[PDB]
């Protein structure tokens, strides 16, 4: 698994690969590693698929309940804090979940990294999963805060593509989103092999 996220001048880019595995066996090449909590809130998944899917859906439930009760959409920081506290109750029981909470509330764009250990950090850019180190290299070498939308899409597409090329547990399709002030939009779903061949041309 490779997932990344970075904030630039025109919002937040979120990109993931779609490979799931069981040992050396590729169980799926089309798994969805982004949950859509609401129109301006997203969550990435990496680690144990059952843990990620279950806890991120439970966060979505609480976010929806938060909205109904307080009559407003939960902030990115409060949503990430909710998840952080939820998984801290099972610390040490071998949960495996590394996720990013991306959205846009009243304090502009927001990106948080949350993991099963209880780590919770706000930042400008993050990468998780087994192919994260490879993604960091590409992302960091081509990141500029004044990147244009098309340029930001390319960087995201490149970072993930290269991670799938080197990391055995990453691959399939790159799914990318773009968090904007009026909500997120799904950018593309490009097969990483199509991309890689064109990059080598």
């Amino acid at each position: 698994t490779t997932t990344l996220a970075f904030k630039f001048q025109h919002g937040v880019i979120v990109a993931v690969d779609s490979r799931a595995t069981a040992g050396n066996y590729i169980s799926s090449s089309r798994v969805n590693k982004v949950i859509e909590i609401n129109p301006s809130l997203l969550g990435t998944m990496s680690g144990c698929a059952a843990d990620c899917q279950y806890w991120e859906r439970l966060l979505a439930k609480e976010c929806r309940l938060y909205y109904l009760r307080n009559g407003e959409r939960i902030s990115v920081s409060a949503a990430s804090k909710l998840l952080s506290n939820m998984v801290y109750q099972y610390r040490g029981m071998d949960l495996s979940m590394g996720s990013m909470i991306c959205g846009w509330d009243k304090k502009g764009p927001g990106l948080y990294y949350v993991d099963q250990n209880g780590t919770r950090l706000s930042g400008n850019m993050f990468s998780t999963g087994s192919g994260s180190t490879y993604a960091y290299g590409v992302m960091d070498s081509g990141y500029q805060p004044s990147l244009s939308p098309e340029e930001a899409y390319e960087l995201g597409r490149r970072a993930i593509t290269y991670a799938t090329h080197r990391d055995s547990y990453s691959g399939g399709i790159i799914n990318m989103y773009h968090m904007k002030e009026d909500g997120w939009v799904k950018v593309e779903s490009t097969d990483v092999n199509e991309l890689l061949h064109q990059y080598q041309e």
């Binding site: 902030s75 920081s77 409060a78 804090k81 506290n85």
Partner: protein, 231 residues
């Protein structure tokens, strides 16, 4: 464990215990809250003001947080319990949402706790009514009022305790946009509204204001005296 139902329905759908709790609020000292443009003022009567009593220990205007404070009427002992509960909730909210609670949010919590005590076994209703003021993150001033039953509304200017009706009648006919124009004027309104019931006008009133962003402030005897001279 005591599991007797204290609050029950009567023939005409009346909860006697809740109404008895409201009777206790009526014997409480008058408390007035006025929502101004950029300020929030609370004013409680001091009733019997002895000369041997430490003034600072029996204040009826406490702070729940930096942006939220409250004045009550009725059973003082009951008020203390409620205030502590609210304070604990404010720190809980600040720790799980990383933000100062909104005035309405804590008002909702206190109201909910009061309702819970009208439908639970072994307990009686809280015998107090509260006026909650403060400012939310955006800067808008708020003023709420909760009662023993658990119901709560947002107000512009309200009065609780003995003489609440009298003060309400005078506040309606005195609350306008040209009455809360400036901070001074807003404070005068509360003081003038408190002068309609509180006997021996002057040092028989406890005043405290909450300006935007800053912490709760308490007016001193001579500071209140000056205001009284202008009225």
């Amino acid at each position: 464990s005591y599991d007797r139902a204290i609050t029950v329905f009567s023939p005409d759908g009346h909860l006697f215990q809740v109404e008895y709790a409201q009777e206790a609020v009526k014997k409480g000292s008058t408390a007035v809250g006025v929502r101004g443009k950029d300020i929030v003022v609370l004013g409680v009567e001091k009733k019997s003001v002895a000369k041997l009593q430490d003034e600072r220990t029996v204040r009826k205007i406490c702070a729940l947080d930096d942006n939220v404070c409250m004045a009550f009427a009725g059973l003082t002992a009951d008020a203390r319990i409620v205030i502590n509960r609210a304070r604990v909730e404010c720190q809980s909210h600040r720790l799980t949402v990383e933000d100062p609670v909104t005035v309405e949010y804590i008002t909702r919590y206190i109201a909910s706790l009061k309702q819970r005590y009208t439908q639970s076994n072994g307990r009686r209703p809280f015998g107090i009514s509260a006026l909650i003021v403060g400012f939310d993150f955006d800067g808008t001033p708020r003023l709420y009022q909760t009662d023993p039953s658990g119901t709560y509304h947002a107000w512009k200017a309200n009065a609780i305790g003995r003489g609440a009706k009298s003060v309400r009648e005078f506040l309606e006919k005195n609350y306008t946009d040209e009455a809360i124009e400036t901070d001074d004027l807003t404070i005068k309104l509360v003081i003038k509204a408190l002068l309609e019931v509180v006997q021996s006008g002057g040092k028989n009133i406890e005043l405290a204001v909450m300006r935007r962003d800053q912490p709760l402030k308490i007016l001193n005897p001579e500071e209140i005296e000056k205001y009284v001279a202008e009225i």
